[PDB]
Amino acid sequence: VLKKNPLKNKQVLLRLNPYAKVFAAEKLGSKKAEKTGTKPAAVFTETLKHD
């Protein structure tokens, strides 16, 4: 009789999507990426800074 919105109403969010509980549990909205120390080539930097 009435359309309840998910993205509010966490009850209907958990009804539609069982993965939302464990998404919130491990906080996959804020997932920290692994740091990589690679550097661009000198040709890339001089092309970028070229007039």
Partner RNA sequence: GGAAUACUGCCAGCUGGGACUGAGGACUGCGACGUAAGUCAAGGAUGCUGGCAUAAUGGUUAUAUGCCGCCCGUCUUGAAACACGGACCAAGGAGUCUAACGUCUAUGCGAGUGUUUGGGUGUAAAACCCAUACGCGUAAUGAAAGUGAACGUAGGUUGGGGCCUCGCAAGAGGUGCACAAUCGACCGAUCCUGAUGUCUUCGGAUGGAUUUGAGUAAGAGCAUAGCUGUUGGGACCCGAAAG
Partner RNA sequence: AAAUAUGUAAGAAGUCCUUGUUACUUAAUUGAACGUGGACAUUUGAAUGAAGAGCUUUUAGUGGGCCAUUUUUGGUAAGC
Report what 1 binds from RNA, another protein, none; CB cut-off 5-8 Å by kind: RNA
Contacts (Cβ under 8 Å, ≥6 apart) of 16: 6
- Whether the CB-CB separation of 20 and 26 falls below 8 Å is answered with no
∠40-41-47 over CA atoms, to 5°?
A: 100
Binding stretches for RNA (CB under 7 A):
1-2, 4, 7, 9, 11-15, 17-21, 23-24, 27, 29-30
Binding stretches for another protein (CB under 8 A):
3-7, 12, 15-19, 22-23, 28, 31, 33, 36, 38-44, 47, 50-51
